[PDB]
C-alpha cells in the first residue's frame, strides 16, 4: 500500500516536535498523542511504535502551583532568581528529558522500518 | 549612610558566622572572642560619650577574668589603674603644664569662672581622654591581631 503517506506524515510530525519541543513546556503555547498515532498507524497496516509510556500526565509544564514531593527541591531549599530558578530549572530539564525519550521512540520506529524495507528516514 | 551601613555589617556578620569552625582548638573560644569584638564595637563606636559625666555607660580586670575562664592568652594591657582619665571633674584638679601656654596669652588665672579659659581646659582634657581611650583600644586590636595570625581566623 501507500504507507509512504503515513510515514511522511509521521516524519513531519517528528520534525515539528523536535523543532520546538521547548514550547511544549509553556502553559498555553500554540500546541496540541501516542494512542492517536497508533490509531492512524494501525489503519494503514504498519507495525506499531512500542512507546515508552502512554499515560503522559506527569510531564510538568506550568503547574507551578500544583505539586510537591521532590527531594532535589528540598536539597535546593536545604541551603539559602535564586531558588525559584532551581525549581524552574529542574522541571524544565525533566520536561525536556521526558520529551526526548518520546522522540527516540519515533526515531527507533523509523530506523526499524528503514532497515527492514530499505528506505530512508531519519 | 544606609546601604554601606547594612553592607559593612552583613560582611562582618558573615565572617562571624563563618569563623565558628576554623579554630578547631580545645573549645568554643569564638563566644568569648565575638563578645569581646562586639564590646570593641561599642567602645570604638562611642568612645566620646565616655567623657561625659553621666552618659549611659559602664574594665580590664573584668575582661581578663572573663578571658581566663575560657583559656585564651590574656591581653597585656597598657594600664590597669584607669583612675586618671579626666571626664567631668572640672571642679576637682590642678597641676597641668599648659598654664605656661595660657599665661603666654592673656587668658586668666586658675579660676574657671572665666568663660574663655573654661573651653581652653576643656579642649585639653577632651583630647587627653580620647588619647587615653584609643591607647586602650589599640591593645584590644593588638590582641585580636595576635590571635588572628596565630590561628588563622579573622577579627579586626
Amino acid at each position: 500500500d501507500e504507507q509512504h503517506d503515513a510515514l511522511a506524515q509521521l516524519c513531519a510530525f517528528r520534525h515539528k516536535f523536535h523543532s520546538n519541543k521547548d514550547s511544549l513546556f509553556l502553559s498555553e503555547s500554540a500546541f496540541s498523542m501516542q494512542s492517536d498515532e497508533n490509531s492512524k498507524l494501525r489503519e494503514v497496516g504498519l507495525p506499531t511504535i512500542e512507546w515508552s509510556f502512554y499515560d503522559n500526565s506527569h510531564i510538568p509544564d506550568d503547574s507551578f502551583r500544583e505539586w510537591f514531593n521532590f527531594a532535589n527541591y528540598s536539597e535546593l531549599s536545604e541551603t539559602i532568581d535564586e531558588t525559584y530558578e532551581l525549581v524552574y530549572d529542574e522541571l524544565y530539564t525533566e520536561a525536556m528529558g521526558e520529551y526526548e525519550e518520546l522522540n527516540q521512540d519515533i526515531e527507533k520506529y523509523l530506523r526499524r522500518i528503514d532497515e527492514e524495507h530499505g528506505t530512508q528516514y531519519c | 549612610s544606609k546601604a554601606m551601613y547594612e553592607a559593612k555589617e552583613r560582611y562582618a556578620k558573615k565572617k562571624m558566622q563563618e569563623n565558628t569552625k576554623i579554630d578547631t582548638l580545645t573549645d568554643e573560644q569564638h563566644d568569648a572572642l565575638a563578645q569581646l569584638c562586639a564590646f570593641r564595637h561599642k567602645f570604638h563606636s562611642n568612645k566620646d560619650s565616655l567623657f561625659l559625666s553621666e552618659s549611659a555607660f559602664s574594665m580590664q580586670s573584668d575582661e581578663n577574668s572573663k578571658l581566663r575562664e575560657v583559656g585564651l592568652p590574656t591581653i597585656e594591657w597598657s594600664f590597669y589603674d584607669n583612675s586618671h582619665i579626666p571626664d567631668d571633674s572640672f571642679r576637682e584638679w590642678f597641676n597641668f603644664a599648659n598654664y605656661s601656654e595660657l599665661s603666654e596669652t592673656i587668658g586668666l588665672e586658675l579660676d574657671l569662672d572665666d568663660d574663655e579659659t573654661y573651653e581652653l581646659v576643656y579642649d585639653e582634657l577632651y583630647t587627653e581622654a580620647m588619647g587615653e581611650y584609643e591607647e586602650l583600644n589599640q591593645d584590644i586590636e593588638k590582641y585580636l591581631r595576635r590571635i588572628d595570625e596565630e590561628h588563622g581566623t579573622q577579627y579586626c
Partner: protein, 1202 residues
C-alpha cells in the same frame, strides 16, 4: 509564687526615647533673628570639606618627606628573602627586619619636621591657612573637638602595627613583596628584549633616568616609594600617553606579544599600589549608571576579558582550577551532571567505601559526621569532577559552553537595553512612577550580578597547592572589576526604595561644643539646658550663653502662675569619682586626710587580689563616709543613709550602696509671667516636649515611650528608671512641600481599606494630608534613659530558668512554628501533652475600649504579592513586602508577650541552622531572623502598658527573661525563656502514635522495586473493612536507624490528592490497578504474585501509589480549604487521625491542621528537654544537652502516648 515572680530587676539596660519639640511663643522667630541655624547647618555641611583640606595637607606631607628617605636594610631584606630561604628561624629574622624597616619609616615620620603638631588643636588654626578657604578652616575657631574622630584614624595611618590602612604595612609588605616578585619575574622577560621597543622610547619619554633594569634591580625602591615613583612604575607597566596620540607601549603588551607563538606561560608585571555614587538626583544617577555600564565601560571590558579567557580556557591545566565548596558547588555540579545530588553522592560513596564497614546500614551520628567531613573540605579540583564524570563528559567543554551561554545571555539583555546608553536619551517620568526604564536597569544589574555569582566559585580561597597561577592572575584581574557592580546595585536599589521624604538631620549645638551633657544642678549654667513641667505640657529650656544664669534668681512665686522646675542631682560614677575628688590637692588641703589613709589608698589595698583586708579598708570606708558628710554639695542635696562599717564586706558593696542612693529629682517652683517675659526678652529658648499623646484629645492608651517618660517624674520612680544624660537635639528640613501632598478633602465620604470594618466608609470634618509631618520642619529630641540602673536579683538567667523548670511540676510551654497555611501558628501545651490553645496568627485582634475589631495580614500579603506579580517584581514591591512583614513581626510580639504572662511558660522557637525544612510560609528566611531580634529585644524588658505601673509586670517592674542579643550564631540552644529547637521531623508526623515515613519511594528500577516489594511483610486486603493493609518491619530498610516501634500496620482509607489537580480514592486506585492486572487479591500475602511481572509501567504506577499511601501532607495549593493532614496508621482505638475530623471542634486534643501540627511537635521537643531537665543534678544543669536527636525524638513521641 509562679515562674515570673523571680525574673525582674535582673540586669541593666539603656533604651532611648525620641520625642518631638515645638518651640513656644516668639522662640522660633528669636532663633531666626539671632541666626542660630545657619551656623550649625554649616557645621554639618563643611565637615567633609575640611576633611578634604586636611587630607590634601596630609598627602602633601607624605609625598614631602618620602623624597628624603633611603632605606638601608632593604638589600638585607630582599636578598635574604629571595635567597631560596631554607630558613631555620631565618624567616623570623626576615620578620624582625620587616618590623624594624617599618620602624625606620616610622622614625622618619616622627622626626619629619615636627609632626607633634599634626593631630593637636593648632592644625585647624595655624599651618592649614598657609584663597576663600580661610573662613572655611576658620569656621571652627571656637570648636575643635569634632575632629577627634579623624585625628585618631589619620594618626593610625602612621603606625607600625601592620594594620590595613596604614602607610608602613603597605609600603613594606605589599609594595615590596610585589616589587621583588617583579624583580624575580624580570628574569623571564630578558628573552624578548628589543631595544627599539623597550628602550628607544620608554627611557626617553618617561624619566631620562637609568634604564628599565634599574626598576627591577632593587635600589630604586626608595625612589618608587613615593606615589610619583609608583606613577612611573605603572607607566612602565601599562604605557603612558604623554598627551599625544602615540599610545606608547608597555611591558604588559611586550609580554603579551610573546604568545604570538600560542604559548605565553610567562607571568606579567603586576601593577603597584599607590599611596592614597548617586543617591541625589535622577539625571546624576542615570549618568553614573551610563558611566559604569556602557559598551566601553570597565566592567563590560572585564566581561569581555572573562569570556575570552573561558574561550581559551583549555590551555590551562585541570589540576588547579578549584571550584568553591558550599552553596554554589551544588548548583555548579547540577548544570554539568544534570542532577543536584550527583556530586554529593559520588563523594558519599567515595567516603563510605573507606570508612563504612562491610555492612551498608548507617547510623544518624555517622551521617552527621559524614556531613561534617563533607563540609570539612575547602574546594574541589576540576580533575576530580572529571573523575566523578562518566564517559562523554568533558568539563573543559561543558563549563565553557555554559559560561558562553551566560555571556551571550548578557549580550541579549544588552540587545534589550541598547536604548539606554544612547546619547539622546530622555527621562519622560521620574523613576518613582516610571516602570519600563527601572525594570530595564534591574534586568541588567541582576543579569551581571547573576553572572558574578556564577563565576564566583572559581577561587578556592587559595591558599592551595600548585594552582594555575597563570589563570588566576588574570582571573582575579577581571574579577576585581566585576565586583564593582555591587557599588551600583547598592546604589540603584537604595535609591529607588527610599521614601519621597528624607530624614537627614544635624546635631544642634547652640554656639557651644559642651551642650546638654548632663542635667546637674550646680552644673546647669555650664550645660545650659533644663526641663520644666506645667500641668502636663512639658517643656525644654535652652538658656543663651550671653545670659547663662536666667534661672538662678527666681522666687518661689505666690501669684499662682508657676512652672515647676527640675533639680536633678546625680552623683556620676561613684566608684571612680570618689577617689578622683578625695585625693585631688584641694580636698587634701581641706580635709587633712590621715597619713595611713593616704598610704592605704596609694598602695591601694581596698581592691581585690589578696591585698584585700577588711579592717584595713574599713577605715577607708569610714573616711569616705565622714568626708562625704563634710562635703557641702553632697551633705545636703541627697539623702545618704548607709549601713555600718562592719556591714560592707566589699568596697564594691559600698560603691553599689552610694550608686543606689545617689540620685534624686524634686521640683522647686518658679514663676510663669517672669519666665515668659524672659523668653520674650530672648535670653531663654523654650521648647515643648510633644508627641501624639500629649495632645488633649488622646482618649486611649499612650505610646509605651510616653508611658516611660511620664513615669520619669513620678513619686513611684524609686523602682527604678533613672533619666540619664547624653541627651541630644536635632533639626530636620522640609523634604516635601505642602502643596503636592495628595490631600483628602474635608466633609467628603472617604474610603476604607480594612475590609472587616463594619463602617465600610467614613468621613471627617477637616483635612488629613498625606505625610504632614515632613511639611514643615520639626525638632527631634532624644532623651536617653537607663532602666534598672541598680540590679538586685543578679544571677545567670540560663541556669536560673532551668533550676526553676526542674522544681516546677506542671510547666506550660508555647511553641511557635511557620506553616504554608499560616505564617505563625501558636500551640500551647501543658506539662503532659494536652493542647491548651491552638490558633492562627493571620488575624490580629486590636482589643481597645470594648471593640474587638480584627484585621488580617494573610490577605494583605497575598493582595500585595499579586501587585508584585503584575508589576514585573520590582524593588519597590519587594521592599514594601519586606516592611509589611516587619510590621507583622512587630505586632506578633504583643500576642506572644501577653501569652507568656497569661500562661507562665517558656517559648519554644524553630532553630534555623539545623534547618532541613521546606519553610514554605510565604515569608523570607531573613524576616525570621529579624523576628528573633525583635523578640529578644522586647523580652529584654517585658511590659504591658494597660497594667498598673507600680505592680509587678508594670512599666517600673518589668520582666527581664532573656539576655541581650550577641551574634547570629550565639543565638542558639537557650536564651532565657526562649528555647531554640531543631525543626527536623516536625511537620510530617502522625501526632497520635508517631509513625513517620522514611522510605525513599521515588521509582528507580524493577531491579530495586522487586526487592523493595519483597521486603514488605504482608500485603493483603481485608474485605470486612475494604482496606489494603500493608505490613513491614523497619529494620530491613536503609536509612532507618531512628524509629522505635518498627511494627507499622499501614492502611489506605481517607481522601488523597493526585495530579492526574484532581481527587482520587486510595483504595479504589489500588483495586483498579490490581484489576488492571487481574488478581484474586483476597488471599494475602500477594507479594508472590507481585514479584512475577516484567513491564515497567506497572511498577512505575505502583511506586507512585506507595508514595501516595505514604504522603501525609495534602495541599490543594490554590485554596485554603483542604490542607488536611491524614495518617495511614491507626492507634489502639482502631481509628486513624484525620485533620478535618479534628477541625470542627472548639478545643481539640490534637492539632487542627498542618501548621498547628508543626507547632505542636516543637512544643513536644521542648517537653522532652524539660523531661531531661527533671533528671539531673543541679551541678550539671548548665551542661544538660538540649540538642535532641532524631532517634531520641521519635522514641519519645512514640512512647509518650502508649
Amino acid at each position: 509564687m509562679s515562674k515570673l515572680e523571680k525574673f525582674t530587676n535582673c540586669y541593666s539596660l539603656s533604651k532611648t526615647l525620641r520625642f518631638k519639640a515645638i518651640p513656644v511663643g516668639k522662640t522660633q522667630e528669636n532663633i531666626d533673628n539671632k541666626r542660630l541655624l545657619v551656623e550649625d547647618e554649616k557645621r554639618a555641611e563643611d565637615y567633609k570639606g575640611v576633611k578634604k583640606l586636611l587630607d590634601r595637607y596630609y598627602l602633601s606631607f607624605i609625598n614631602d618627606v618620602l623624597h628624603s628617605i633611603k632605606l638601608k636594610n632593604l638589600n638585607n631584606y630582599i636578598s635574604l628573602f629571595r635567597k631560596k630561604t631554607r630558613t631555620e628561624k631565618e624567616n623570623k629574622e626576615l620578620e624582625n627586619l620587616e618590623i624594624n624597616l617599618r620602624k625606620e619609616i616610622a622614625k622618619a615620620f616622627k622626626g619629619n619636621e615636627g609632626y607633634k603638631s599634626l593631630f593637636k588643636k593648632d592644625i585647624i588654626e595655624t599651618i592649614l591657612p598657609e584663597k576663600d578657604e580661610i573662613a572655611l578652616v576658620n569656621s571652627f575657631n571656637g570648636f575643635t573637638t569634632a575632629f577627634t574622630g579623624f585625628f585618631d584614624n589619620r594618626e593610625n595611618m602612621f603606625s607600625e602595627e601592620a594594620k590595613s590602612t596604614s602607610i608602613a604595612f603597605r609600603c613594606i609588605n605589599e609594595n615590596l613583596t610585589r616589587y621583588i616578585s617583579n624583580m624575580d619575574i624580570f628574569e623571564k622577560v630578558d628573552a624578548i628584549f628589543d631595544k627599539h621597543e623597550v628602550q628607544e622610547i620608554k627611557e626617553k619619554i618617561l624619566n631620562s633616568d637609568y634604564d628599565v633594569e634599574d626598576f627591577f634591580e632593587g635600589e630604586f625602591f626608595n625612589f618608587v616609594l613615593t606615589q610619583e615613583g609608583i606613577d612611573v612604575y605603572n607607566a612602565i607597566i601599562g604605557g603612558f600617553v604623554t598627551e599625544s596620540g602615540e599610545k606608547i607601549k608597555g611591558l604588559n603588551e611586550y609580554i603579551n606579544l610573546y604568545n604570538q607563538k600560542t604559548k605565553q606561560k610567562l607571568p606579567k608585571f603586576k601593577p603597584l599600589y599607590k599611596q592614597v555614587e548617586g543617591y541625589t538626583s535622577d539625571e546624576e544617577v542615570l549618568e553614573v549608571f551610563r558611566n559604569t555600564l556602557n559598551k566601553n565601560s570597565e566592567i563590560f571590558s572585564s566581561i569581555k576579558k572573562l569570556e575570552k579567557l573561558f574561550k581559551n580556557f583549555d590551555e590551562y591545566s585541570s589540576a588547579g582550577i578549584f571550584v568553591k565548596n558550599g552553596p554554589a558547588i551544588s548548583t555548579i555540579s547540577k548544570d554539568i551532571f544534570g542532577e543536584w545530588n550527583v556530586i554529593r553522592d559520588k563523594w558519599n560513596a567515595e567516603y563510605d567505601d573507606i570508612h563504612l564497614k562491610k555492612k551498608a546500614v548507617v547510623t544518624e551520628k555517622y551521617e552527621d559526621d559524614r556531613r561534617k567531613s563533607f563540609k570539612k573540605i575547602g574546594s574541589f579540583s576540576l580533575e576530580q569532577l572529571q573523575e566523578y564524570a562518566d564517559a562523554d563528559l568533558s568539563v573543559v567543554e561543558k563549563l565553557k559552553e555554559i559560561i558562553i551561554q551566560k555571556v551571550d545571555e548578557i549580550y541579549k539583555v544588552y540587545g534589550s537595553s541598547e536604548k539606554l546608553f544612547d546619547a539622546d536619551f530622555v527621562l519622560e517620568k521620574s523613576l518613582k512612577k516610571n516602570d519600563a526604564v527601572v525594570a530595564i536597569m534591574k534586568d541588567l544589574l541582576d543579569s551581571v550580578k547573576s553572572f558574578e555569582n556564577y563565576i564566583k566559585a572559581f577561587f578556592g580561597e587559595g591558599k592551595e597547592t600548585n594552582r594555575d597561577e597563570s589563570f588566576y592572575g588574570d582571573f582575579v584581574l577581571a574579577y576585581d572589576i566585576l565586583l564593582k557592580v555591587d557599588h551600583i546595585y547598592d546604589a540603584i536599589r537604595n535609591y529607588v526604595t527610599q521614601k519621597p521624604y528624607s530624614k537627614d538631620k544635624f546635631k544642634l549645638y547652640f554656639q557651644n561644643p559642651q551642650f546638654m551633657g548632663g542635667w546637674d544642678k550646680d552644673k546647669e549654667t555650664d550645660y545650659r539646658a533644663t526641663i520644666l513641667r506645667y500641668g502636663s505640657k512639658y517643656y525644654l529650656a535652652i538658656m543663651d550663653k550671653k545670659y547663662a544664669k536666667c534661672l538662678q534668681k527666681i522666687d518661689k512665686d505666690d501669684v499662682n502662675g508657676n512652672y515647676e522646675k527640675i533639680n536633678y542631682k546625680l552623683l556620676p560614677g561613684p566608684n571612680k569619682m570618689l577617689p578622683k575628688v578625695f585625693f585631688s590637692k584641694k580636698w587634701m588641703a581641706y580635709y587633712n586626710p590621715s597619713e595611713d589613709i593616704q598610704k592605704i589608698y596609694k598602695n591601694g589595698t581596698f581592691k581585690k587580689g589578696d591585698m584585700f583586708n577588711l579592717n584595713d579598708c574599713h577605715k577607708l570606708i569610714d573616711f569616705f563616709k565622714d568626708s562625704i558628710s563634710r562635703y557641702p554639695k553632697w551633705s545636703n542635696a541627697y539623702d545618704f543613709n548607709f549601713s555600718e562599717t562592719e556591714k560592707y564586706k566589699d568596697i564594691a558593696g559600698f560603691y553599689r550602696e552610694v550608686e543606689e542612693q545617689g540620685y534624686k529629682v524634686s521640683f522647686e517652683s518658679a514663676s510663669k509671667k517672669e519666665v515668659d517675659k524672659l523668653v520674650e526678652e530672648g535670653k531663654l529658648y523654650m521648647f515643648q516636649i510633644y508627641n501624639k499623646d500629649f495632645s488633649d484629645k488622646s482618649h486611649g492608651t499612650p505610646n509605651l515611650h510616653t508611658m516611660y517618660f511620664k513615669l520619669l517624674f513620678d513619686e513611684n520612680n524609686h523602682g527604678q528608671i533613672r533619666l540619664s544624660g547624653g541627651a541630644e537635639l536635632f533639626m530636620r528640613r522640609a523634604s516635601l512641600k505642602k502643596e503636592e501632598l495628595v490631600v483628602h478633602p474635608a466633609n467628603s465620604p472617604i474610603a476604607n481599606k480594612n475590609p472587616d470594618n463594619p463602617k465600610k466608609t467614613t468621613t471627617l470634618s477637616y483635612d488629613v494630608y498625606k505625610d504632614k509631618r515632613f511639611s514643615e520642619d520639626q525638632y527631634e529630641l532624644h532623651i536617653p534613659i537607663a532602666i534598672n540602673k541598680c540590679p538586685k536579683n543578679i544571677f545567670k538567667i540560663n541556669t536560673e530558668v532551668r533550676v526553676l523548670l526542674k522544681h516546677d511540676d506542671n510547666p506550660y510551654v508555647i511553641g511557635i512554628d511557620r506553616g504554608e497555611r499560616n505564617l505563625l501558628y501558636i500551640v500551647v501545651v501543658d506539662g503532659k501533652g494536652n493542647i491548651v490553645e491552638q490558633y492562627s496568627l493571620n488575624e490580629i485582634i486590636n482589643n481597645f475600649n470594648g471593640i474587638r475589631i480584627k484585621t488580617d495580614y494573610h490577605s494583605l500579603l497575598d493582595k500585595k504579592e499579586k501587585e508584585r506579580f503584575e508589576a514585573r517584581q520590582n524593588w519597590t514591591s519587594i521592599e514594601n513586602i519586606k516592611e509589611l512583614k516587619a510590621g507583622y513581626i512587630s505586632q506578633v510580639v504583643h500576642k506572644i508577650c501577653e501569652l507568656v504572662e497569661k500562661y507562665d511558660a517558656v517559648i519554644a522557637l524553630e532553630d534555623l541552622n539545623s534547618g532541613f525544612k521546606n519553610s514554605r510560609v510565604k515569608v523570607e528566611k531573613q524576616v525570621y531572623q529579624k523576628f528573633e531580634k525583635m523578640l529578644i529585644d522586647k523580652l529584654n524588658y517585658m511590659v504591658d502598658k494597660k497594667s498598673n505601673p507600680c505592680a509587678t509586670g508594670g512599666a517600673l517592674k518589668g520582666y527581664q527573661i532573656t539576655n541581650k542579643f550577641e551574634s547570629f550564631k550565639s543565638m542558639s540552644t537557650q536564651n532565657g525563656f526562649i528555647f531554640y529547637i531543631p525543626a527536623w521531623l516536625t511537620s510530617k508526623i502522625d501526632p497520635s502514635t508517631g509513625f513517620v515515613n522514611l522510605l525513599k519511594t521515588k521509582y528507580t528500577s524493577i531491579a530495586d522495586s522487586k526487592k523493595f516489594i519483597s521486603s514488605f511483610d504482608r500485603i493483603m486486603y481485608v474485605p470486612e473493612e475494604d482496606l489494603f493493609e500493608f505490613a513491614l518491619d523497619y529494620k530491613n530498610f536503609s536509612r532507618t536507624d531512628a524509629d522505635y516501634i518498627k511494627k507499622w500496620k499501614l492502611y489506605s482509607y481517607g481522601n488523597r490528592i493526585r495530579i492526574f489537580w484532581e481527587e482520587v480514592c486510595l483504595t479504589s486506585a489500588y483495586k483498579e490497578l490490581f484489576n488492571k492486572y487481574g488478581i484474586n487479591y483476597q488471599q494475602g500475602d500477594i507479594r508472590a504474585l507481585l514479584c512475577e511481572q516484567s513491564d515497567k509501567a506497572f511498577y512505575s504506577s505502583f511506586m507512585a501509589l506507595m508514595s501516595l499511601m505514604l504522603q501525609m501532607r495534602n495541599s490543594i495549593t490554590g485554596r485554603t480549604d483542604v490542607d488536611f493532614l491524614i495518617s495511614p496508621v491507626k492507634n489502639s482505638d482502631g481509628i486513624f487521625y484525620d485533620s478535618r475530623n479534628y477541625e470542627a471542634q472548639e478545643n481539640a486534643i490534637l492539632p487542627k491542621n498542618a501548621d498547628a501540627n508543626g507547632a505542636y511537635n516543637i512544643a513536644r521537643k521542648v517537653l522532652w528537654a524539660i523531661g531531661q531537665f527533671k533528671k539531673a543534678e543541679d551541678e550539671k544543669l548548665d551542661k544538660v544537652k538540649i540538642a535532641i536527636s532524631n532517634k531520641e525524638w521519635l522514641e519519645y513521641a512514640q512512647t509518650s502516648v502508649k
